[PDB]
Nucleic acid binder design. Structure first.
Ligand code: GTP
Ligand code: GTP
Ligand code: GTP
Ligand code: GTP
Ligand code: MG
Ligand code: MG
Ligand code: ZN
Ligand code: ZN
Lengths: 339, 347
DNA sequence: ATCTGTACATGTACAGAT
DNA sequence: ATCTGTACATGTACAGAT
DNA sequence: ATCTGTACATGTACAGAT
DNA sequence: ATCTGTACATGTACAGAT
């Protein structure tokens, strides 16, 4: 039943090949153009495709163009925890996010203009968004969200001190090492000079290193169903989102965040046995429903930032989604059979 | 259970002793390391790498023996395996002073290393420290220190190579079911080391850096022995086995062919065979130590203990240790086992 | 003025001491 | 159970070199 | 600084065995 | 139906060459 839904959601090797061939061509060319400002940006592949939790089709790719910036001093934007002003080549741009993003965007647009071999344009800017989004066609439509990121090597900002609570799951050495990696700021505004913390590199490591046992999902270990539960939850939200515009405030990052909390609460690999796929997916739904009822879903890395605060999503939107989730749950998920 | 807990208490190093030992050792090592740079010496660029029992937290009784590698990156090198041994190699291509004819001479390089070290120790006035008489074929320059208490420091010259590990290790390090494939792949991306062992130009592979990572990352669960996880008894078993051999070795010269590396190697195989943290529960310390002894005994009787990293190299071959020596040790181990380990009460 | 090899500054796991 | 010394990895300041 | 070569993890596809 | 073995595909870290 759920195994059959997963088969439908499984990407095809043929489609992966053709999509990657084109995406890589464009990304490689844009990256080269950035190397003569922005000289020295490096590529960092992130999100669902590179975490192996993309579903249905290879039609959405996420790439960070990270740029190492020396001595930078952060000031937290009021008490938000996730948003910062940045202070001290890039003198052209207090470091303005929208100004930097504009130049980044312009360069990208100029280079896409010179691309004749592939059918590719740049999507109209969504205000406040950090992304420069490319729309490709080898007939099939493919999105590429290209994210400018500042890389900083200092200690992570104080607001994350008590975040990433993996100690009982992945452990203290993993946590200490992860927090020795750089941190990232992307120009998602809150206004025009604000940046937002990104942990896409950390999320990627976790997705690919997700077990309490080192062998989880390896050739000489036991398969778990952690990723399959993530896929099913993503698909449920995607399907619901297609039908009801009441759910515009919700995104896949809410699901990702929720499952991180679940994986922390249930650290044992044996609590995610493939044979218990139903129970596992069900307990995930129950957890997400408690998050909705209590209007509380803390950022996994920034515990004081509630993604489900009133200020961000209306009670009515949360109650709408609850009713819709409870319905699918108690009727054998008819929405999975939809197209 | 509790008898063995009491032995471990005795074996536990004291923080006072650790402090005083480390203070002195670090002073000497730092000074020797600086001498290798600050002068236009062939060893310019050596880096320090702390290895062995003290740095793995399995040193027992006293902080009286420290192991330190002075590693030197050597680019374009071609290795030739010395007669299918698997562990021994000739090296070919600053260091031209030792490059006796395409071949990089181990003993020549070790001699110069040794001379420099001797000269620098001679200039040390703060501390009571001399250089021990060279043991032929040994790779070590050994320092003997006294803040009254006697402390050995074995300083090992090592060539660092960043290429893939030699073919003879391909099927070694069988940690797939225990620490897993990602850990193994990453470990094998680290450099490999050659220490100075026809004979005078041969070098031997070293995996001290890999052994160190394993000792400190020894569980199938990432939380093994961490503040938010469960204690295992893997290291405690290693200490007990080390102590049994150490005690036996100080009494009987019949056991001169044996060393702590045999015990370390044996326990690596045991940890591979019994990968689950639950097979090394603290409450089962006795059973765990017992099964280790039984395994070591089988190795001795069948004359077979494969190097953990170089499977075709048998540390217990006839060619290396007489059957007599192995039978002597078997009898001695079986005796202690079946009489409540009287040798643990000694001293 | 700028760059750099060396030493120090900071954080934390591990294990011993209390 | 909490506190504390050592080791070790990574960042960063800087007298000496360029 | 950039580019490639190598090795192997994480996938998908499918047949034969269980 | 599930598991196991092989083949085929992509991603990615890092060394050595340029
Ligand atoms: N902090 C933060 N990170 C976000 C947010 N949205 C997206 N991200 C990050 O950007 C990545 C890409 O976002 P998306 O492409 O929308 O989602 P995805 O995880 O790739 O999954 P898909 O919906 O299958 O594409 C996510 O995996 C996160 O790492 C957000 O609101 N906050
Ligand atoms: N890799 C990565 N991609 C990100 C991150 N933040 C945002 N993105 C990308 O940018 C897209 C839009 O970012 P959002 O966080 O949704 O921002 P927005 O669309 O301006 O605002 P809302 O969706 O209303 O919150 C995401 O779908 C991702 O593809 C991040 O931290 N990392
Ligand atoms: N391949 C190999 N490595 C060895 C051998 N002897 C020692 N080593 C390595 O060098 C390290 C130091 O050796 P020792 O000081 O004799 O032993 P140890 O492991 O530190 O334990 P102690 O007996 O407490 O000193 C070991 O941990 C090994 O990594 C040997 O015969 N062969
Ligand atoms: N760190 C480190 N120390 C090593 C290594 N190999 C040897 N040593 C040290 O050097 C000492 C002598 O090396 P061995 O190979 O044991 O000496 P040998 O002269 O060949 O003979 P025995 O000591 O009788 O086995 C060891 O006890 C260690 O202290 C190595 O790979 N790494
Ligand atoms: Mg995505
Ligand atoms: Mg030692
Ligand atoms: Zn898994
Ligand atoms: Zn343990």
């Amino acid at each position: 039943k759920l195994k059959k839904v997963l088969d439908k959601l499984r990407l095809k090797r043929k489609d992966i090949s053709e999509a990657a061939e084109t995406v890589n061509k464009v990304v490689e060319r844009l990256l080269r153009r950035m190397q003569k400002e922005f000289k020295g940006v490096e590529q960092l592949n992130t999100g669902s495709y590179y975490e192996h939790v993309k579903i249905s089709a290879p039609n959405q790719f996420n790439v960070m163009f990270k740029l190492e910036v020396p001595r930078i001093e952060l000031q937290e934007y009021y008490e938000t925890g996730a948003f910062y002003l940045v202070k001290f080549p890039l003198s052209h741009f207090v470091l303005s996010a929208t100004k930097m993003l504009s130049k980044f965007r312009k360069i990208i647009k100029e280079e896409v203009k010179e691309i004749k071999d592939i059918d590719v344009s740049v999507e109209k800017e969504k205000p406040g968004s950090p992304a420069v989004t490319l729309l490709i066609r080898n007939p099939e439509e493919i999105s590429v969200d290209i994210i400018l990121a500042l890389e900083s090597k200092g200690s992570w900002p104080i607001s994350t001190k008590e975040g990433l609570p993996i100690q009982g799951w992945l452990g203290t050495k993993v946590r200490t090492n992860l927090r020795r990696e750089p941190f990232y700021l992307v120009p998602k505004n809150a206004q025009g000079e604000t940046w937002r913390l990104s942990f896409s590199h950390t999320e990627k490591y976790i997705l690919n290193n997700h077990g309490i046992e080192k062998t989880c999902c390896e050739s000489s270990g036991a398969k778990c169903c952690r990723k399959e539960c993530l896929k099913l939850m993503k698909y449920l939200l995607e399907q619901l989102k297609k039908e009801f515009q009441e759910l515009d405030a919700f995104c896949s990052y809410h699901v990702k965040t929720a499952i991180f909390h679940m994986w922390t609460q249930d650290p044992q690999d044996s609590q995610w046995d493939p044979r218990n796929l139903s129970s596992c997916f069900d307990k995930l739904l129950a957890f997400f429903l408690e998050c909705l009822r209590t209007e509380k879903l803390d950022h996994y890395f920034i515990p004081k930032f509630n993604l489900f605060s009133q200020e961000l999503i209306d009670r009515k939107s949360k109650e709408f989604l609850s009713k819709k989730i409870e319905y699918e749950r108690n009727n054998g998920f008819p929405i999975f059979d939809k197209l």
